[PDB]
Amino acid sequence: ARSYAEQLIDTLEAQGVKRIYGLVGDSLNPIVDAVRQSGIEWVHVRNEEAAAFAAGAESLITGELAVCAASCGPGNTHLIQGLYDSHRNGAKVLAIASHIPSAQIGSTFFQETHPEILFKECSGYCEMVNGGEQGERILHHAIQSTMAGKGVSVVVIPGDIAKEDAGDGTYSNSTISSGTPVVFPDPTEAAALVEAINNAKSVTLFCGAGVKNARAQVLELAEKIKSPIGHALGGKQYIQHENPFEVGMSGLLGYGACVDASNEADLLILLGTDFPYSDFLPKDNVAQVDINGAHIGRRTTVKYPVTGDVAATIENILPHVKEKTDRSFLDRMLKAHERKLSSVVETYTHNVEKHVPIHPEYVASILNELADKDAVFTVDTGMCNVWHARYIENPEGTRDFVGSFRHGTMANALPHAIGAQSVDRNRQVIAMCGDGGLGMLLGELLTVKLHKLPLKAVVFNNSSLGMVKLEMLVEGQPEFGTDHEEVNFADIAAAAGIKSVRITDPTKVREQLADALAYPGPVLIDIVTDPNALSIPPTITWEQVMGFSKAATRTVFGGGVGAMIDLARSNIRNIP
Amino acid sequence: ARSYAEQLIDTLEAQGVKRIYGLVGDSLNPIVDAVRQSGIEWVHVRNEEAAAFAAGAESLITGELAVCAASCGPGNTHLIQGLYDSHRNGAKVLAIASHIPSAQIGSTFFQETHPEILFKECSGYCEMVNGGEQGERILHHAIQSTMAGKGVSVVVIPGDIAKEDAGDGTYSNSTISSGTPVVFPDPTEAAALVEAINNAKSVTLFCGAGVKNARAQVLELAEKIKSPIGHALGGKQYIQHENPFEVGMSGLLGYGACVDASNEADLLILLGTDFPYSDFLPKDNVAQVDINGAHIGRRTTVKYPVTGDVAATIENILPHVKEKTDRSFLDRMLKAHERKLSSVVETYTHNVEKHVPIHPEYVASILNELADKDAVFTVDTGMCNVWHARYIENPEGTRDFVGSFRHGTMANALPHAIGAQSVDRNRQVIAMCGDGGLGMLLGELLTVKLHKLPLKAVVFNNSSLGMVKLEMLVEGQPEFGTDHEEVNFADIAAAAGIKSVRITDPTKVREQLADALAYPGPVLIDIVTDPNALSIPPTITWEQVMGFSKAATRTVFGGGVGAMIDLARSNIRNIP
Amino acid sequence: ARSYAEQLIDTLEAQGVKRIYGLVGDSLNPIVDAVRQSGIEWVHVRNEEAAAFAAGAESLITGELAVCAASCGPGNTHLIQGLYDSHRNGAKVLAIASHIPSAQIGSTFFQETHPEILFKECSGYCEMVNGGEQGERILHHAIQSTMAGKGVSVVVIPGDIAKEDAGDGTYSNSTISSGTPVVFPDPTEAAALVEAINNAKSVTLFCGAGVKNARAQVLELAEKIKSPIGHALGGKQYIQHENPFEVGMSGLLGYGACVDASNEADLLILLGTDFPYSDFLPKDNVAQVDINGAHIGRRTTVKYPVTGDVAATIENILPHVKEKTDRSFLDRMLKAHERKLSSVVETYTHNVEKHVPIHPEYVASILNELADKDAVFTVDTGMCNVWHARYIENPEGTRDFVGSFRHGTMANALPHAIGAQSVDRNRQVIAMCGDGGLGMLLGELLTVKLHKLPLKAVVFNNSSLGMVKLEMLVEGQPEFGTDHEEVNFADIAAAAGIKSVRITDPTKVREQLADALAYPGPVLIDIVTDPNALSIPPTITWEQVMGFSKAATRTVFGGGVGAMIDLARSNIRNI
Ligand SMILES: Cc1cc2nc3c(=O)[nH]c(=O)nc-3n(C[C@H](O)[C@H](O)[C@H](O)COP(=O)(O)OP(=O)(O)OC[C@H]3O[C@@H](n4cnc5c(N)ncnc54)[C@H](O)[C@@H]3O)c2cc1C
Ligand SMILES: Cc1cc2nc3c(=O)[nH]c(=O)nc-3n(C[C@H](O)[C@H](O)[C@H](O)COP(=O)(O)OP(=O)(O)OC[C@H]3O[C@@H](n4cnc5c(N)ncnc54)[C@H](O)[C@@H]3O)c2cc1C
Ligand SMILES: Cc1cc2nc3c(=O)[nH]c(=O)nc-3n(C[C@H](O)[C@H](O)[C@H](O)COP(=O)(O)OP(=O)(O)OC[C@H]3O[C@@H](n4cnc5c(N)ncnc54)[C@H](O)[C@@H]3O)c2cc1C
Ligand SMILES: Cc1ncc(C[n+]2csc(CCOP(=O)(O)OP(=O)(O)O)c2C)c(N)n1
Ligand SMILES: Cc1ncc(C[n+]2csc(CCOP(=O)(O)OP(=O)(O)O)c2C)c(N)n1
Ligand SMILES: Cc1ncc(C[n+]2csc(CCOP(=O)(O)OP(=O)(O)O)c2C)c(N)n1
Ligand SMILES: [Mg+2]
Ligand SMILES: [Mg+2]
Ligand SMILES: [Mg+2]
């Protein structure tokens, strides 16, 4: 550790960092020279935006720090979309934003920007290096902030300072606190929750991503109080599989009896969720358990706020919660859930398997069956979120899911898959791409080829901004600016040196997709899908689609559901 | 004009806006519905970053307002790179940044960002619409700010407010002031400049972009005081052609006797330039005429500061400037200029027509000769800046040039060409692309096909981040992270439906390029060039290449020059 | 110039800076040591907010750079109110914001703030020094930015870097461009304005602060086209005095026939004004000449925009403007102006000399007569803005006026007077203070005493937030939170060592104010005034007072006017 660049790389390497995603240039050159000499791999991308998405996806998969790096001015500026996504997803990311020479700061120099100001909204820590010793210190603070769960950390490094001497080791010698504290609730809040539960004749649990390490506790509580369990999109991968109390998801992409179970129960308990669609939530009698107190009551009236961890709160309250022997509400909701899903399959999916262009719901149904039990699925923003929510299951809980569920950016699927795949080349990674999303960052097909990343990019090629076509249908606005001439992604992937398949016949989807998923290397599957595979109830308004309608609602987008119906049916047969 | 969305489009249409570049979505839907009903064309791009670059390039070509538009959160976030470039270039751009519903602001909603804060550095005006009447007002202020020369204007529009009623017309009915005032200098400042000129036995003029409308005045002054004229890269297109006093350019990409003429004259006059490389500038006796007083003395010691327009200042001082009958310095500099260029052609261009892989300087030389006399040239940041500076000329001043000369971003050439070509489809547009730059925004090949834009994309495919390889060579750092496996851009362009040519044999460059430039439609010419076509003097340091070396320098990068030698030679024959 | 602190002070001294207002501490210590060794005077204030107001007022008086300086974190944070005011007023100010040691930046250290981010809104240039050479460079850029008219410049200096070596002199050796370019309009815009003027049978000129160096041109144009001349508050000190076309001011504090002349003329020409009250402006046929093109059309419909200097634009268009021999509109507006002012004096100033508690309008009338012909007047935000506008005149144009007319902060009068008075101790400076404004920065009475600044602080002590009481009256809201127990500012000023007078009897105002203004040294005159000296027409709404009412209006606050009526009457001669 002689220069600050060398010390920064030695510090990252000592903490277990295995790769840095980025694009070399100017102020970043001394850092990449240190990378070359180290055991850290340099992962070259075509656009720095993909490096920030890849680091965010890698972190979500590993639970460890991930790093992206970019050159001065326009170089680090490109990181921004990926940093907002990684930040909203709570990924542990350190972004090395190289900066113009310090002597040029404030002189309107060539490539001058102020990244230390620009990145404030997409980060929990964002400071500028002004010397080697201070640089070592703020590198520690950036790492310690993101490892403590404060979101993205940005370190802004003027290129001349990267070549100055390293600090004396005081801050790089530290052990980073990366543990998970056990957050028990305030007894007063837990007591009010116990009383609310005991006073209620019927209770519904609505779970989000905060339920990640509380499956056993949520299920034990549900068995005791006979409560149906619904979920937000972020809670789907953790609480839906093998759940005897399963009642679906809320929101426009929702399914089953979740909205009804949530609005008809005496008490609704929000468990680790920040579900933003308030019009689907009741206001009369709601409790909320959230580890971040500032998030409580953000989405609806909350009468019983509880600041705490889901598993710890449930373990604390369980001895005081009385066993409810009455299952009437639960049985009634389980039956209504199965009827709603059966009705949805009959209304929108009957005999659709031979319609041309190919129905995307048929593709997603096959994709769910053919993908490995431990595959990583990345989901591009748009109609692919509808197909993932209703057709991609997580049996045994061994699959991983990376998407832009909060920032809602298009084009995330391929760069997220690049990061996810880099962690382990022997694990299957499926990128559910949109044609719009892929075309937005098309040059990342060159990155997949360069690094020989064996991901399977499944393009739902509807030649449309599918989700926008749906919005305009809801508004009543004539279709404009959404659908354009067809693009052949299989030929583009082949021209870039990637094995490709084009699927246009629905009777060939199963076999061609099976062949592609089995191929030992990168594959792009270009599936020509129907952009008009949409069914929207006439009562849905533009205000509802945009998320600002206040009136109570239970209406979801039309369309079918997949393999989730098998659990719904098995739960009906298992009613005592 | 019933809604604010309709009034905004009616206002832009009444001001002569012919097209809006963007990508439809969510909050932007009511605005694009109004576009559909209007005479304005909607130009769909694959990535919103290209819309902001295209609007910037269109404005630089027309001298009128240009408009880009993007959806909420991640949509408008993509505009940022293009807005920094358009802002630094002084383009007249209005960016419509659609925003999340106003009821959701402050609630950490799905896709929430604060564009009104994020865009402050890349704009002269950036405000949020909070109602219809105020929206009409700030739309006027945004347009009036950018039309007055204050740079990019951003109007942040929450989607719900786009559907509310329009204002009463008070601000939309205004005539926008788009005139160019005539800025005469302060008599005290002008008098000190007269004295400095009269006391000097030899004077050199160093011109930048501010000399755009002062060619006659610069030339008249130069004939009176016998002064050689040099230029910054931004002044090249205006002052180099048919200039009997021409002595080249300064900086690392420079050529000819400019650095010598500038440092050896008794007085150096900076005329409309903000040339950032201080180590190439003298400090002892410098005068500076700039229309923005805050820019004076930003780059070197200035003893005679003059706040004013170049043409007006020169016309004011001319009757008081005594005629210099001594041409010794001018003749000496004209001869030294021609010798330096002749030496550079002999040293670096010997057998260039047979060099394999194809020498980029040979390509640029052919390109200059074959392109139309009125073509628009767009230049990708990197080695293409070296080839444009030394080989692409502007005879008669009828050609236009769009590049990222100030913000210095990669990937600008194709999106700049999309904007420039949309102005007039009967005018030739050449995009000098880098392989790095093209791969960074590769999906814009789909935009060229979609809009049938007949631009000629000339890819200097060296399979390298050429400019970074140069930086590492100068530093002494082992080559790492710059060169990767070859990519076939002709096959990618053909797979996207674009006519393409792959050139690998130098003896075929002239014929294949001539055939391609003549084709009536979009063409991608993939030229396999040599990444090692670099000649760097051993004295150049990393500090110099990064722009923070303070010691005086006259050293430029090795390499030849093109057709500029013909004017240098004709000026020798015209010496009395 | 061995250290950056020494070089910074040498550069300021070489540019003619005579004093720096501030408060020494921590990171600012090496800079104040360099001030001590230099010919620059250190002016200690009690609160750094007063240093920024004082620099802003000094600059407005001299037309030159003025400097304020403050310590790290909380020290420079106090500058902020004064910097927003100096910035809105277009003052040429350099703010030296000392900062925490560079090694501590990013570590949540004791006193840590980010002034380089905090001050972006109240400045045209704001950067952080990271080393001696770069510090010299950004010092140049900061000075050159504010001297070119871009507003306040802030230089953020980490204390450790102040002691590191100075730069090599390249940027400090430069000559700063402080000239005034001559901005002629675009011929196309000027030609459209000529046509608009020639087509109009009647024209009104409405002037703001941009008319400062164009009096001769405005008057020559007015004589040619027979146009009445009105003004915004910012234009009052330049265009009202000895004006044969004078028709008053617009807005709620307005007077005379200005609103009528502006809305009844065939063409209204806005000349160097950014008057923000759109409801008083017509929309049908308006032209605007402004040196900053981005300001055109900001307040009303403008059909004839002209980017350019007022004097240059007028000189350029004059040979093409045809002489108007018809004076009908001008005579009708001159007569209506005199009638309106006469009516206002009869209605609201009857028996004002005997009114108890003392009427502030009677005080302002006496103050205008007793103050020197070249006095500087500083005006606290609130009811004092009404009294200054309607009673304080500028005969011969030798008086100066400093106020918070744009940022609208209370408490500016005393600190602005401190800066104005420091320029020349032989010149009279009158601070028209509010009791609210004085109480807000009361510790600056200690600064006046310390520096023996012979300013005359005239406190309009109404025991109220007078302007807020007016707002609640207009809204119909019951009076609450505005009026409190009386404070004796004369006793407080005397306890601080300052000669003071307390005036409670209206019959004593003239003699006590004459004695006080004649006193050779600082004086605080505590005048017990009536907080209910308000006459508000019943149609004035809360939306109007707040500035967001859309409907066209010609209504002004009731109340009299002063010595301005003598010009209105003299202008009626030859009717
Ligand atoms: C096109 C599109 C459409 C969408 N439509 C829908 C839709 O119809 N329905 C839907 O449900 N989603 C939808 N989403 C996603 C939606 O916007 C939200 O992002 C999502 O509902 C949030 O899920 P969540 O509550 O699990 O996650 P988050 O919003 O991340 O909330 C997790 C919460 O748990 C808390 N927490 C974390 N750890 C713990 C712990 N140990 N103990 C306690 N609390 C903890 C956190 O503090 C946080 O408040 C859509 C996304 C896209 C891209
Ligand atoms: C990879 C790369 C390498 C580069 N290398 C070099 C190099 O070696 N050499 C080089 O020269 N450039 C180089 N450049 C560009 C360089 O960074 C600057 O952008 C350029 O030198 C500025 O040119 P300019 O002074 O003409 O333009 P600007 O920087 O835009 O300056 C124009 C000036 O004129 C003033 N002005 C405008 N209108 C008027 C008027 N009517 N009257 C008076 N003043 C007016 C403006 O206020 C401004 O200060 C490089 C760019 C890239 C991308
Ligand atoms: C309590 C209170 C009440 C107020 N009430 C009123 C009221 O009733 N009436 C009123 O009039 N004001 C009122 N004001 C002040 C008001 O808010 C504005 O600040 C004022 O009207 C603006 O005056 P102005 O146009 O002269 O100045 P500015 O707003 O500073 O405008 C000057 C303009 O001239 C331009 N300019 C500058 N130099 C030149 C040049 N050489 N050539 C051409 N253009 C140039 C500038 O670009 C600018 O646009 C009040 C203030 C306070 C504190
Ligand atoms: C960067 C960005 N631009 C725009 C949007 C708005 N948006 C959301 S979904 C969508 C369409 C996505 O099209 P595609 O990726 O092809 O998916 P589809 O819905 O057609 O399956 C758009 C424009 C966004 N979320 N992000
Ligand atoms: C967005 C961005 N990232 C990084 C840089 C730094 N940089 C400047 S030139 C260059 C290489 C450009 O490569 P290419 O486009 O292939 O052009 P070449 O120099 O090889 O001709 C890089 C990385 C930049 N200017 N902009
Ligand atoms: C710092 C600040 N706080 C509050 C206001 C709002 N305000 C404007 S005038 C005024 C009352 C001023 O009272 P005083 O200074 O006593 O003057 P008066 O109007 O009573 O003459 C107030 C509260 C303001 N302009 N600035
Ligand atoms: Mg699609
Ligand atoms: Mg290249
Ligand atoms: Mg008061």
DSSP B282-314: --SSEEEEESSGGGTTSSS--SEEEES-HHHHH
Q: How many CA atoms lie within 13 A of A191 on its CB side?
A: 3
* Token output for C488: 């004796």
B372 and B354 in contact (C-beta within 8 Å)? no
Cβ distance of C130 and A130 shorter than 8 Å: yes
Where are the extended beta strands (E) located within B39-163? 41-44, 66-70, 93-99, 125-128, 153-158
* Technique that determined the structure: X-ray
Report the distance separating Cα A328 and Cα B265, nearest Å: 98
| A461 touches ligand 4 (CB under 6 Å) | no
Q: Chains near C, with 3+ CB pairs < 8 A?
A: A, B
CB under 5 Å of ion ligand 9: residues: C 434-436, 462, 464, 466
Give the strand pairing for C182-184 and B182-184. Answer: antiparallel
CB neighbour list of residue A163: distance below 8 Å, 6 or more residues apart? A3, A4, A5, A30, B542
Which CA distances in Å does A203 have to A245, A287, A576?
A: 12, 10, 19
Q: Give the sign of the dihedral formed by CA A418, CA A423, CA A426, CA A428.
A: negative
- In this complex, the residue of B32, B117, B468 whose CB is nearest that of residue A121 is B117
* Token output for B155: 């109007």
Report the distance separating Cα C119 and Cα B301, nearest Å: 28
Q: Give the sign of the dihedral formed by CA B314, CA B319, CA B320, CA B326.
A: positive
Residue B433 CA, closest ligand 5 atom number? 15
* Token output for A15: 């903490």
Cα(A422) to ligand 7 centroid in Å equals 26
Residue of A nearest to C127 (CA): A106
Which CA distances in Å does B360 have to B263, B372, B460?
A: 31, 20, 7
Report the distance separating Cα A357 and Cα A462, nearest Å: 9
Give the strand pairing for C286-290 and C267-271. Answer: parallel
| B457 touches ligand 5 (CB under 6 Å) | no
Report the distance separating Cα A470 and Cα B29, nearest Å: 11
Cα(B464) to ligand 8 centroid in Å equals 4
Q: Which residues of C touch B308 (CB under 8 A)?
A: 181
B143 and B82 in contact (C-beta within 8 Å)? no
Which residue CA neighbors atom 9 of ligand 4 most closely? A382
Q: Which residues of C touch A141 (CB under 8 A)?
A: 106-107
Report the distance separating Cα C76 and Cα C113, nearest Å: 9
Return the bridge partners of B69, or none: B22, B96
Neighbours of B220 (CB within 10 A): 14
Interruption sites in chain B after residues (C→N beyond 2.5 Å)? none
Report the distance separating Cα A219 and Cα A315, nearest Å: 12
Which CA distances in Å does B351 have to A470, B125, B359, B537?
A: 61, 53, 10, 21
Report the distance separating Cα B310 and Cα C2, nearest Å: 38
* Token output for B280: 């190439």
Q: B105 exposed, middle or buried (CB, 10 Å; 0-12, 13-18, 19+)?
A: middle
Report the distance separating Cα C156 and Cα A514, nearest Å: 63
CB–CB contacts below 8 A, A to B: 235
| C235 touches ligand 3 (CB under 6 Å) | yes
Residue with tokens 């030739």: B428
Where are the extended beta strands (E) located within A61-171? 66-70, 93-99, 125-128, 153-158
- Smallest CA–CA separation between C23 and chain B, in Å? 29
Q: Chains near A, with 3+ CB pairs < 8 A?
A: B, C
- Smallest CA–CA separation between C144 and chain A, in Å? 12
Return the bridge partners of C307, or none: C290
* Token output for B101: 């519903």
C70 and C96 in contact (C-beta within 8 Å)? yes
| A553 touches ligand 4 (CB under 6 Å) | no
Report the distance separating Cα A440 and Cα B75, nearest Å: 11
Cα(B203) to ligand 2 centroid in Å equals 21
Report the distance separating Cα C203 and Cα B452, nearest Å: 54
Residue of C nearest to A131 (CA): C103
Runs of H (alpha helix) within B226-359: 236-239, 258-264, 310-317, 328-348
CB neighbour list of residue C428: distance below 8 Å, 6 or more residues apart? C371, C372, C374, C375, C376, C456, C517
* Token output for A520: 């030992």
Which CA distances in Å does C461 have to A139, A331, C530?
A: 57, 77, 8
Runs of H (alpha helix) within B354-406: 360-370, 383-391
- Put residue C494 in one of left, alpha, beta given phi > 0 → left and psi -120 to 50 → alpha: alpha
Q: Output the CA torsion B466→B467→B469→B471 (10° steps).
A: 170
Q: State the first-to-last Cα distance of chain B, in angstroms, to the nearest integer.
A: 67
Residue with tokens 């028990």: A184
Residue with tokens 């048919």: B242
Report the distance separating Cα B364 and Cα B143, nearest Å: 38
Resolution (Å units): 1.9
| A389 touches ligand 1 (CB under 6 Å) | no
Cα(C62) to ligand 4 centroid in Å equals 59
Which CA distances in Å does A339 have to A347, A352, A362, B240?
A: 12, 20, 21, 79
* Token output for A251: 């929101």
Which CA distances in Å does A147 have to A22, A68, A126, C362, C442?
A: 21, 15, 14, 69, 49
* Coil, strand or helix at B45: coil
* Token output for A501: 């398949």
Amino acid in the structure at residue A248? G
Residues of A comprising the binding site for Mg(2+)?
Answer: 435, 462, 464
CB under 5 Å of ion ligand 7: residues: A 434-436, 462, 464, 466
Cα(B87) to ligand 5 centroid in Å equals 20
